[PDB]
């Protein structure tokens, strides 16, 4: 799963295993993290959710 964020376009705000386009926004005007499922992550300390 994507976990995106909007800087130039809220399609930069992306959850997906499906790709898209951003125009006029890289890092600096995008957002991307790894936000998916299929895991109940029990005891994650030292890297907050």
């Amino acid at each position: 799963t994507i976990r995106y964020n909007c800087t130039c376009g809220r399609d930069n705000v992306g959850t997906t295993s499906t790709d898209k386009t951003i125009n006029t926004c890289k890092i600096d005007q995008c957002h991307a993290a790894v936000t998916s499922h299929d895991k109940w992550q029990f005891t994650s300390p030292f890297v907050p959710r």
Partner: antibody, heavy 117, light 110 residues
Framework: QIQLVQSGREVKNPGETVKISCKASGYTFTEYPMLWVKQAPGKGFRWMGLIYTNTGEPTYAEEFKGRFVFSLEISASTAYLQINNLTNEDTATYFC??????????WGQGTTLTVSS | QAVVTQESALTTSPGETVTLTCRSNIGAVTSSNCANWVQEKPDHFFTGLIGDTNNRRSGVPARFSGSLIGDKAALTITGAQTEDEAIYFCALWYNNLWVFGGGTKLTVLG
């Protein structure tokens, strides 16, 4: 759609510095990380770095670590290639470009460099 | 690092156009490496007609085609006329930026 509205063949001292501009006209370099690179004159272009769109800082090329430096005349989303360590072998072209689709989609002008007495 | 092990020249002619099969000195061809044909002329400026491995260029007629071709980047000055030939820089941008490789000098009739 980047056109590097820049300067031309600037000239320098041996070792001294000078900044050749490229303000980005035609397209949106205010979100466009666009090439402001050198020019090795025998082969063509020179990978001297791109300039990120929002912040205005470049990433600098490996052979551009040296002469070309980054600045951001971002009033149209543009920049300028600084020149430090003005060479004996630094006489050569320079270019700009800006587009999408991780290659630079348009190749602007730049200008030549006369690093000589 | 890599090379554009292919046509550093191109062979375009009247009735046709030259597609430089700029073969892989980097690997296989791809649009992710962004193997492009940035066309140029006297006045020395490289300009985009086919890039990113599937994209066309703006202001371009039907004289171009941009992809991976053969076993490398594939740059077609394909539709060479008096307005359809150029010396193209070999677009290589493997998620970084399209800089010059070999680059095929495709001809045209005129």
């Amino acid at each position: 759609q980047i056109q590097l509205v820049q300067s031309g063949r600037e000239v320098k001292n041996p070792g001294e510095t000078v900044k050749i501009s490229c303000k980005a006209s035609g397209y949106t370099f205010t979100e466009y990380p666009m090439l402001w690179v050198k020019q090795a004159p025998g082969k063509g272009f020179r990978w001297m770095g791109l300039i990120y769109t929002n912040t205005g800082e470049p990433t600098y090329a490996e052979e551009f670590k040296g002469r070309f430096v980054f600045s951001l005349e971002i009033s149209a989303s543009t920049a300028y290639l600084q020149i430090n360590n003005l060479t004996n072998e630094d006489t050569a072209t320079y270019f700009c470009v800006r587009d999408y689709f991780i290659s630079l989609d348009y190749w602007g002008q730049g200008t030549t460099l006369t690093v000589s007495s | 690092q890599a090379v554009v092990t292919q046509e550093s020249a191109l062979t375009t002619s009247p009735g046709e156009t030259v597609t430089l099969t700029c073969r892989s000195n980097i690997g296989a061809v791809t649009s992710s490496n962004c193997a492009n044909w940035v066309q140029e002329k006297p006045d020395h400026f490289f300009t985009g007609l086919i890039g990113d491995t599937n994209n066309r260029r703006s202001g371009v007629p039907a004289r171009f085609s941009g992809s991976l071709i053969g076993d490398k980047a594939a740059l077609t000055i394909t539709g060479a006329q008096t307005e359809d030939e150029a010396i193209y820089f070999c677009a290589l941008w493997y998620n970084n930026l399209w800089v010059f490789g070999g680059g095929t000098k495709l001809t045209v009739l005129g």
